[PDB]
Design a protein around this ligand. Structure first.
Ligand SMILES: CN1CCC(NC(=O)OCC#Cc2c(F)cc(OCc3nnc(S[C@H]4C=CCCC4)n3-c3cccnc3)cc2F)CC1
Ligand SMILES: CN1CCC(NC(=O)OCC#Cc2c(F)cc(OCc3nnc(S[C@H]4C=CCCC4)n3-c3cccnc3)cc2F)CC1
Ligand SMILES: Nc1ncnc2c1ncn2[C@@H]1O[C@H](COP(=O)(O)OP(=O)(O)O)[C@@H](O)[C@H]1O
Ligand SMILES: Nc1ncnc2c1ncn2[C@@H]1O[C@H](COP(=O)(O)OP(=O)(O)O)[C@@H](O)[C@H]1O
Ligand SMILES: Nc1ncnc2c1ncn2[C@@H]1O[C@H](COP(=O)(O)OP(=O)(O)O)[C@@H](O)[C@H]1O
Lengths: 736, 488
């Protein structure tokens, strides 16, 4: 029947809920909240609530792991759908905790966290399948045995959910939801989808590779700082996609008595190729196979060469993927990067911004979060933390809450039931204490981010916004028209203008609008690389942009090296290496190399050349209309009272940049907070204000900073004229 | 394998090394391939263990004793020749270096068709464009690029043909048509493996791509093409042909273009050493790398070596006495390569006044060719060559645009035509998105050039053009000897 689709990872967290596209929903005869019934590859069915999501196509039907392990359907398989609506309100259903997840958890766990979830929202029920409930810091898999003599059941107040719990073991057909999967990684979206596309076809359908002459991907080089989830990602898309996952430690093979270690290395590969299409994971390929040139012993050279020969001979069987984990690609010997041996690098990188947020919800869903936690704030607070730190941060705050409840509940030495854990509510105190205690593991590594700065956060510069969106967004969506006229699109823009005017903000907005990774190389980094004669690190930065494509590379303070030299002939070491890497990356056509200069007059003229930063966009001081938008964008988060006059503050400030207005609004916020704190402490010492009042802005404007004024604004205009190059050719007309 | 012999238990590894040579000399005239001679025989001086020294010495003795049988070739693979111990380069032991180098330009194209002939390519793929797109990729990357695009097409067809777990026949594969989407996605996903290595290329720039400079073209074709095809007449008169030309003139006027055209006309390899490379070697005190560059030109002969921005090192010092580190090593290597007579050492200076006078000497860059700003006639050819690929409407007046622009270099006219193309593409995209939001232009119209000429750049003008002319006079050295006649 045409009512059969392909499964996709669900963007929601609700269990027994199917998210489908609206045209497919009406083609499938589905209403807004109609129950949709599914038939899997094996003898099991599960009725689910339909959901209208616009992020998926008709064929892509979103499903959780909950409605995937019971349906015996892996990610990227065919699901059969047929509706069958009957009332059938459940009469004394037989949901049971029968599994291996109920260990050391006793008490009223049968109903404490089932009433808020399993007895709410009229969710559909089925027998023979297993759903999941996350409560009391516990993710419990509950199976249901009887749901009335019908394959379609809906929960009801008379379902009773009577208690018949047993330690009955699970069957091998069902997959453990406690085991990792696609939903257990949140900090990586593009990098996880890369591995998905890489290894879904070779693993799910090895017969196609055996049939069609292709070179299957046999070798992965997942690299990144330790604790970023490379092992987690390997286990996730090796058990959810594949069926066997080997986890040789790395130090285990470097530790054993030479011959036995190599025997284990051979035997792991053999068992991978003997059992089924599997994934071999080398967690410490940097340790097993370091740079052979710098090695001293020869038995380690024998280990490296034996690994090389095993990988070269692993071209057979057409179905075995070999994932390898390391901290950086320039530390492995330059022989594990050859064709057929870890030729694909899928660099993970530090989790960035909302990605860290997307990690926290994975380690908090089983836990509780009360109602006062600012997960976005703690996500912006945890800068420089790999996913392991966020797992520890979510575990240290939970342990802080538990240890604060230990004094409340004294003498407790039992299973501690599951009701007090349900009553546990981790607040901002525990998370703040854990964040203060937690230490970043990967902070000095350059962060590859997708910025949260949008066009709404950019005040004014409408002409600059139009030029940017017609210069970088145009080629990425209309390549045919660019190819027809025979012109390589301009890559690289040098934003010149007054400092603190919105160049980094504009670059971040460009990165966010195109949903591309953003690498900001600030002036401190360039000056550090210049002073220590570390220009060879510049290459690494570009290599990072090559491994995080598409990138919106931003060289903030491109004149910082020129400023540090006095402000002869320019052409410094780091700037020259930047020029060389720009010439190298001009053929990438996937990374943008945006620059920035707060003093464009003292700059290397080589930076202004085709292939390099040819297009020049001037970021002028905001005018009367632009300052209103700048102040509104800098005060959207702040609770500003309506009685203030921002469009008059725009009129009064004439030569104020975006940074100056941001300082003005931040000082107004500071005075508002100071007055609120003074009032609160005075009331506490005796026994307030809900918004930034007018007087706060009145007092803040007394320290109104104008960083750039008069001749400085002239200089850019001078550099404008010298770079506008009208040269008297304006208003030039051809003859008829 | 190489690592196979470095991996086994010493004695068994050497037994396999002996037995491979024996079976090669026992069966028939064969070829022994050492895929990792760099791994089997690294620099013996820097090695720590002695059993690896035993391996290196045993390989050396086997190769020395391989002078027999008169029919066994022994190929060896490595990443660079300066990493092997300086004993596997002796006579009779890998004495011939046949350096492969990164595939260059159309060569990468010539690789793609090898990995695409068995595959399909639909009808919209621009193989030349993706060949120009895959800069810095070895043939393995192109094999993976042709395999990742094919796999992208297959995986996009997996959703169309559901439930397929069979041999998948051969008819749907015939119906498979890899388009530009798959190749673009694979190129974005693919990572270059050899990008930092210097590229040895045969340029696609021909004399047709060079606008104007007919006298310079004639001088070049009579100065470098003449000796390579008439050596007997050069030998008869007793004169070593001039090797090395210093192109001086305004920047962005066609010096690199002329060098590439010279390389393409003679079908010789082209090595471009730009100003960034020289400045990097000067700043890091890496002048020893200059040798390597010349060594590359020695292993890619014939070469048309081009030192773009030969005054870049002098510019970075202020613009005393010149004679910088990298320029001095370049002088030494020029003196070394003056006896090659197979590589040309063309230079380029956008500011020839501040240059090392040692660079102007016999054996070194003696001949000097001035690349002047294009005149009224040359600008027509420059604009036509820069607009051959672009679909320019016939109603435009390029020979009038040549008249209007006076001090415009080739780079300035190229920027003008590129900006006209940019405005044409912008108008086309605006019209298309407006039609899509409501429901165009087929060529670069007149108004596009009209708007582009409003930002007409003149990079070099007035006294700058004087300076080269000054350097012309100081180097023309008429000295009053013009119109000098012998007595009868
Ligand atoms: C006159 N002579 C004749 C022969 C030859 N001319 C020819 O025949 O070919 C012309 C072409 C082209 C082209 C391309 F080379 C890359 C493209 O893809 C866009 C894209 N994808 N990602 C990016 S980065 C972006 C991702 C968004 C966030 C930021 C970074 N860009 C892109 C965007 C802007 C600039 N540059 C590349 C499309 C093309 F049409 C040379 C000249
Ligand atoms: C007065 N004292 C008396 C005794 C002695 N004089 C004498 O008796 O001998 C004179 C001679 C000679 C000669 C030669 F030494 C090399 C030749 O071959 C040409 C060639 N082949 N490839 C190249 S490079 C080219 C390949 C094309 C693309 C670019 C690079 N060139 C070549 C071309 C231009 C300049 N130089 C070499 C021919 C000769 F006739 C010394 C002076
Ligand atoms: N992107 C992520 N999302 C969720 N959890 C993560 C992420 N990255 C790391 N973690 C957590 O950090 C831990 C890292 O463990 P592991 O993957 O074995 O080591 P490594 O990350 O060094 O390979 C995992 O237990 C995982 O729960
Ligand atoms: N056009 C603008 N709209 C909104 N905020 C701006 C604008 N320009 C600057 N800002 C504010 O200035 C602050 C710093 O700006 P910055 O990016 O450092 O300027 P520049 O790029 O000139 O150095 C940011 O917090 C931002 O909120
Ligand atoms: N004589 C010419 N004919 C055609 N195009 C030219 C000419 N001179 C320069 N150009 C154009 O200028 C651009 C860059 O020139 P370039 O080789 O950098 O000049 P220079 O060698 O003086 O630095 C090239 O894309 C080329 O198309």
């Amino acid at each position: 029947r045409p009512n059969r689709l392909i499964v996709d990872e669900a963007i929601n967290e609700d269990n027994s809920v199917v998210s489908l596209s609206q045209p497919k929903m009406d083609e499938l005869q589905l209403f807004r909240g109609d129950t949709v019934l599914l038939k899997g590859k094996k003898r099991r069915e599960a009725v689910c609530i339909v959901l209208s999501d616009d992020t998926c196509s008709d064929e892509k039907i979103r499903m959780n792991r909950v409605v995937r392990n019971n349906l015996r359907v892996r990610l990227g398989d065919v699901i059969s759908i047929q509706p069958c609506p009957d009332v059938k309100y459940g009469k004394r259903i037989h949901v049971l905790p029968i599994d291996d997840t109920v260990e050391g958890i006793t008490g009223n766990l049968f109903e404490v966290y089932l009433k808020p979830y399993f007895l709410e929202a009229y969710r559909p029920i089925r027998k023979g399948d297993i759903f999941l409930v996350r409560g009391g810091m516990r993710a419990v898999e509950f199976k249901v045995v009887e749901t009335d003599p019908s394959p379609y059941c809906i929960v009801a107040p008379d379902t009773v959910i009577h208690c018949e719990g047993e330690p009955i073991k699970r069957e091998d057909e069902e997959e453990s939801l406690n085991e990792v999967g696609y939903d257990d990684i949140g900090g990586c979206r593009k990098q996880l989808a890369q591995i998905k596309e890489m290894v879904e076809l070779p693993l799910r359908h090895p017969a196609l590779f055996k049939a069609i002459g292709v070179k299957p991907p046999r070798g992965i080089l997942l690299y990144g700082p330790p604790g970023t989830g490379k092992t987690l990602i390997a286990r996730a898309v090796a058990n959810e996609t594949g069926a066997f996952f080997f986890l040789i430690n790395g130090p285990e093979i470097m530790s054993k008595l030479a011959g036995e270690s190599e025997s284990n290395l051979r035997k792991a590969f053999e068992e991978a190729e003997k059992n089924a299409p599997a994934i071999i994971f080398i967690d410490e390929l940097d340790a097993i196979a370091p740079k052979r040139e710098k090695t001293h012993g020869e038995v380690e050279r024998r280990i490296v060469s034996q690994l090389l020969t095993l990988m070269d001979g692993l071209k057979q069987r057409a179905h075995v993927i070999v994932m390898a984990a390391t901290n950086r690609p320039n530390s492995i010997d330059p022989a594990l990067r050859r064709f057929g041996r870890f030729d694909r690098e899928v660099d993970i990188g530090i989790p960035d911004a909302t990605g860290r947020l997307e990690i926290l919800q994975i380690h908090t869903k089983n836990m509780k979060l009360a109602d006062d936690v600012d997960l976005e704030q703690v996500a912006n607070e945890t800068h420089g933390h790999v996913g392991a730190d966020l797992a520890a941060l979510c575990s240290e705050a939970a342990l802080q809450a538990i240890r604060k409840k230990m004094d409340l509940i004294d003498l407790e030495d039992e299973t501690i039931d599951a009701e007090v854990m349900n009553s546990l509510a981790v607040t901002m105190d525990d998370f703040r204490w854990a964040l203060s205690q937690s230490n970043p593991s990967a902070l000095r590594e350059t962060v590859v981010e997708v910025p949260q700065v949008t066009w709404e956060d950019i005040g004014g510069l409408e002409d600059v916004k139009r030029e940017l969106q017609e210069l970088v967004q145009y080629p990425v969506e209309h390549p045919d028209k660019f190819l027809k006229f025979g012109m390589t699109p301009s890559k690289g823009v040098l934003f010149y203008g007054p400092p603190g005017c919105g160049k980094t903000l504009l670059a971040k907005a460009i990165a966010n609008e195109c949903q591309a990774n953003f690498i900001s190389i600030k002036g401190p980094e360039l000056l550090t690389m210049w002073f220590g004669e570390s220009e060879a690190n510049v290459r690494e930065i570009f290599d990072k942009a090559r491994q995080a494509a598409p990138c919106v590379l931003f060289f903030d303070e491109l004149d910082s090296i020129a400023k540090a030299r006095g402000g002869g002939g320019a052409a410094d070491r780091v700037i020259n290496q930047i020029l060389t890497e720009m010439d190298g990356m001009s053929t990438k056509k996937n990374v943008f190399i945006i620059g920035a200069t707060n003093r464009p007059d003292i700059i290397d003229p080589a930076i202004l050349r085709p292939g390099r930063l040819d297009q020049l966009i001037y970021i002028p001081l905001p005018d009367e209309k632009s300052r209103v938008a700048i102040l509104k964008a800098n005060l959207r988060k702040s609770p500003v009272a309506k009685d203030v006059d921002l469009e008059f503050l725009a009129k009064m400030t004439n030569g104020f940049s975006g940074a100056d207005l941001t300082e003005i609004c931040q000082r107004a916020c500071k005075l508002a907070i100071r007055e609120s704190i003074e009032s609160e402490i005075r009331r506490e010492r005796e026994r307030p204000v809900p918004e930034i009042r007018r007087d706060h802005f009145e007092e803040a404007m007394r320290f109104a900073r104008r960083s750039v004024s008069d001749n400085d604004i002239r200089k850019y205009e001078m550099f404008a004229q010298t770079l506008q190059q009208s040269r008297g050719f304006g208003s030039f007309r051809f003859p008829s």
